[PDB]
Structures are given as structure tokens and as C-alpha cells.
Ligand binder design. Sequence first.
Ligand SMILES: NC1=C(N)C[C@@H](c2nc(-c3ccncc3)no2)NC1
Length: 340
Amino acid sequence: EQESVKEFLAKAKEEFLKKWESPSQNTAQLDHFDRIKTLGTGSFGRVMLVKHKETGNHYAMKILDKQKVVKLKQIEHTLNEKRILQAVNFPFLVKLEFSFKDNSNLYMVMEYVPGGEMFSHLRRIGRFSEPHARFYAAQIVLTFEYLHSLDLIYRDLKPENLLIDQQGYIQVTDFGFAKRVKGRTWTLCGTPEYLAPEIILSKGYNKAVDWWALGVLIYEMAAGYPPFFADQPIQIYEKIVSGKVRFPSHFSSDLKDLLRNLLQVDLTKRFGNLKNGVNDIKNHKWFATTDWIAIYQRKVEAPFIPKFKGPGDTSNFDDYEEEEIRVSINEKCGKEFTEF
Ligand SMILES: NC1=C(N)C[C@@H](c2nc(-c3ccncc3)no2)NC1
């Protein structure tokens, strides 16, 4: 508990709270950009590569359909996402540069990270070596230390949401389930393979669900597949609440010991949620070679640099059908999104 770390987190919370209490709004508009390519797509929104017409800079624009947000009951979650993203600041979190709305849509304009998703690189290589997995895991440990000290839970850790930048480091994206929480919270949300047992059982839960998800991620990076999988979600949930996990023989003894303490079904015994907090993780034998300050300062040479030609290259993302960005002549759902 060195005073330099305590003072760092105290200042981090001061700066977050000032932006949290006075958010920015309406800092660009759609016809300031040229549309280039669809980078991914979902049930109420998509992400598109765009170019700013006056500066030439590239950005990733997240577009949400207001009517579909209402129908799928995601109003509060969408308002959480933009308010948190405009208030945070950390080396491994993606930067929000603009936000605005119009008659039909909500827009969040982020920095474009051209190296692609961790998911693509993991599946192409097969599995990551333990030093490679540990480089990425250390970045997530520091990011969760930051978020939890601001009373934020993240709730969507998985390889699809971790983007690899030009230096080989992580940028975390997608804050659609992130929330400010003083105590417990109760919403059923997340991705099935990564959910903690207390979410599945409809209990009130806390930041310990992020430390469970870190155990799932480290297992998946080091093995090539997640610890709990099956064809139907109900079958995945039965394996999770049992907590029975089998480890490949190539895992080191230190790795198995860390994973047994992160994938602990009893949340009151889980690493990250004991009296010493994150320091039970930082001081574990599996992290003995990690220089925590050098990682934060980005002074460690990364194990892998993505191949791409420049800031507008899309070769590390995949191909989707290209659809219109339509804006109605009439305003939709104006009252619901007043504060956006
Ligand atoms: N399943 C999900 C994806 N598959 C993509 C992800 C997301 N990616 C970006 C992005 C930011 C900057 N540069 C490139 C991409 N923003 O959100 N949302 C969830």
C-alpha cells in the first residue's frame, strides 16, 4: 500500500468525479465525417470506420438506433456507457473523442485502434504462451484496480472487446454494461461463458464478478478455449455453478493455483474480494516476473505487433453487409434520451 499508489488513485477519483457531475454533450455532427467500412454489428447498433473531413483523422463511430434501444430495454445502460466513457482516463481504456444525437440515432466517436480484436489473434495462433498471456493479464489487473476505485463495475470482459494497438498493448472497448455501484447490483447481463455463479443465481452481486471473468479470460488465453462451454446456455450455467474445472497438463503449477482462486464459486473467498484486495493478485507467484510500473508506463516491449499498413487499414477486421445510416425527418424518442 505505497503512498504513491494511494495518492495516484485519489487524484484519479477526483478527476473522474468532476467530469461525472458535468458531462459533455453535442460535440460534433454526422456530416462532419465520411463513412468508410462497417467494422462490426449487433442487435441495436454497429461500429463503423469514418474519416473527419476537415482534419483527415480516422475514428471508430458506434451508432445506436434509439427505437431499438427502447424496445430491448437498454435505455439506462446506454446512458451509463456514454457518461462513464466521457469521464474516464487510463492508458488501456479507449478514448471517446466526440458524442452527439439526431432524429434517429445516438453516436459515440472513439479513437480507431487498427490492430483488431484479441479474439482474432488468439484463434489464428491457437493459444498464447504463458508470458504472452501474462503481459495482457497484467494490463487488465491494473485497469480493474482503476475502475473499481471509482466505484465502477465493467461486466463484459471477453476477447472480442480487447483491441490491440500499434505498440501491441490493449485498449478496452464496449462500456454498454458498465455501471457506477456503491454496494450490490442486480441486473442479468453479460456473455454466458464469462458469467459468475452469483449472476446466474439472481443474487445481488458486486465487483467480484469482474475478478471471476479475469479467471475465465486467462484460462482461455493460455488454453485456446474457455473453461465452461456447451451447445446451450443452460448447459454452460450448470457447469459454472458446479465450478468443476479441468486444466490442461501444459499449464504451470503457479497458473493452476491462481485460476483456482479466481474461479472460486464462493464469492467471499475469491481473489480480488478479500481484505487485501487487488494485492493478493499482484503478489501471486504467477506474476513474479511482472514489472507493474513498467507496464503502466508502456516501457515493456510487447510480445506481438499486429501487421497493418497505416491508420486507415482495415485488414485486421472482417466483412459485413453494408447498410444505410438513415435519419428520419421526424424526431424519435426525444424524451427518453434528453440527457445524452
Ligand atoms: N462484439 C463487440 C465487438 N465485436 C466490437 C466492440 C467495439 N470495437 C470498437 C472499436 C474501437 C476502436 N477501434 C476499433 C474497434 N468499439 O466497440 N463492441 C463489441
